């Protein structure tokens, strides 16, 4: 009937306010798989957000070295920075400082209160600090991108030039942290099994997981707008232009599904078109020899099944032969 | 002989063609082998067992 | 209204009977059985879910408890039809309550060939591949990077 | 037709009388899904009471295992056939070859 | 939807009198038509009885004292 | 820039043959290539508007498990051949065509009495072999447009429509497309890199139009997406 179905969600669990589990039911026999795959590939790669991009340290140029004042190695600090959920306004790229030392461990709330940006979890610890004379500070620089950015594409940027700013750290521009789609069987009142989608997701806290789903949906809609029927139904306008009679009149007589002898004795009377037979009565039919009950009854019953009558009055003949 | 017959056609000599998933639409690593095998349907259907 | 009306309804096979079936098979476990039962594990209890076709879908792992291959084995199914029997099947004869063999304390839930091969492939590591020598922040980030 | 055959197929198809075999070589005179009329060659024709051969293809009928056995024609009009050749493949046969 | 009853085995001595208590309570609540004390999830009486035994608000001694006091109040209402 | 990127567009409808065609969409930023390819492939293979035969009606033969004197093939192979063909209807959705023929020869789909709206995509498809001379075939063929695929036995709704013996049911496996392959390559741009251009090749029955099928698939996907573009705690 060229009319599919629409799902009706029944379970939207928002446990921990950052780990969501949504359901969708029901779907078609294969829509769930493709929908889950598309949503996953969009959230993972094509999902613009914000994350840390560049780090600046005092004098530790190489990752294979250690600066006193911390009980970890620079790799641990980099891993901690990689999970710094911060969001930025319309600005494309912004730096932030952490020129702070002390005794206790350094956390995300120690960053300067830059009004243009905001940290999601200020209580997130950056690094467990040494409890004595731990004089060490750093600087971060965040941007906005498309998705996960490894260090390989930044190796070329490092090869370009080398100021003090040239450091290496990955960037998870995708605000979603993890995603998993699954398909199950759903029971319609008559249809026994259809695809029921279950999407579990977890984000960095920058946006609501349902907000991320809606953002993926609108980005997919914007991508597909170039081919969406050109309209809602593609034709909210109906007209009509047809001739007064049917093209059956132009069709030859052999399209009447009659016996071979009847067709032969009808074609012998120069009646090779239906319209040339509708506009005449059967008084002349019986005049032609070998026109008995069989042929006459067959012709009259065929034209009865066709609705037209034997013997009509029309002037438009023959258009256009 | 089978290698030469495969070489006659455009098919690969290794007899293992890569496959693409229908659901997720990605490539399977370790290119699996695909061919045309003759199969039989036994007289042990499910309509007479249930 | 009467039993004949209910019989006519269930033979007419309408749509208002399927929800009733889902309700009555919501928490009513059935008893699956292998044709040869060497030990007690040849008979177990299972919660039924409605499937399509005319064949019985069985969990892949539990077949190891029956030593039942999938070459055409015909299994039987029974119903408790008794509150006490239903409770007993849910308490003792259930599959979850029977994980260790009666002969040895080793679990009868040992994984089969497909899953162990998949997990071995997932764990077997090479020396050089995509993403070699990098660093990850967690298992979920690793799954994202893999996908 | 089985792709990877063993050569014996042909034989095992022509030995079992499940398929229609040409008792006398000739030319096809009349094809039909049930009746096959073959004009016998005058050389292989009997001296007296000369005529043709008429094979009645065994249509859908119950076998000993409740399996439908049937023979389908596999020759065209006027197709020359020799003695011992196949005329109609029965069940699990194709072009005179065991195709289960 | 009950999947594990191990905590019930750790509560009662073993499974025999456990399921005996379960059957008694289920007969008293489903056929007897009494009111349970655990929130239901649109399910049968079996899983509800299992859950209420798993909690601890019903057991052999509890059912004994409950039915004794019920007979007492029934005879009092008769009086 | 990095946000609010462009949208793809169809840039070619080149049909390498009458049935086999190949369309190209461009441009795609990154990652959208395989996503859109797999999505469109699954939507096309799942369900498309088809116009195959649903049931036939022959005067001579009663049940499909019998024989008709004059024809070479069996009624089962006849029905399989009738299923093999494809027609295109524009005005109405269901239509009853008539196949009538006589004389010795290969009777194909061109011998039917076609109508103005109904059109045959390929008349070379052989239907039967009228090997006998005095053998006249005359039958009715019902073709209704649907969505997806339905078996033959499960398509019943009552027991009175099948009372006419001549009504022979066939599984309406209407599917205009047969195989959809897709790939992605480098695209073209003034000053940019890593742009993706998608190419979809389609081996179909020839009934549906490539651009029309792509548009229908896109509309179905857009409807299924709009089902939850603004999803909330709705019931
Ligand atoms: Mg076996």
TrEMBL record, chain C:
It comes from the Bacteria. Mg(2+) binds at residues 69, 71, 73. DNA-dependent RNA polymerase catalyzes the transcription of DNA into RNA using the four ribonucleoside triphosphates as substrates. Belongs to the RNA polymerase beta' chain family. The RNAP catalytic core consists of 2 alpha, 1 beta, 1 beta' and 1 omega subunit. When a sigma factor is associated with the core the holoenzyme is formed, which can initiate transcription. This is DNA-directed RNA polymerase subunit beta'. The gene is rpoC. The chain holds residues 392 to 538 of 1407 of the full protein.
